[PDB]
């Protein structure tokens, strides 16, 4: 498996440094230490994104 997910819903940056992506963006879960905000990547950028805006891939 590869620490990643998939933005079930396009996401937007609400703060300053939050990951920014759009539905289908594989968020590279870089730090799932959070229950609702995994510090991860998506397509070249990284930061905090809501683990819910994405879904875990690989199985």
């Amino acid at each position: 498996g590869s620490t990643y997910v998939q933005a079930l819903f396009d996401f937007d940056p609400q703060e300053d440094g939050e990951l920014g992506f759009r539905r289908g963006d594989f968020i590279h879960v870089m730090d799932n230490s959070d229950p609702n905000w995994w510090k991860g990547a998506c397509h070249g950028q990284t930061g905090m994104f809501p683990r819910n805006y994405v879904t875990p891939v690989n199985r």
């Binding site: 079930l8 819903f9 396009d10 609400q14 703060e15 939050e18 959070d34 609702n36 905000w37 905090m48 809501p50 819910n52 805006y53």
Partner: peptide, 10 residues
């Protein structure tokens, strides 16, 4: 930290 409260999905 500033994880922010999970936003509402569309």
């Amino acid at each position: 930290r500033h994880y922010r409260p999970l936003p509402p999905l569309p």
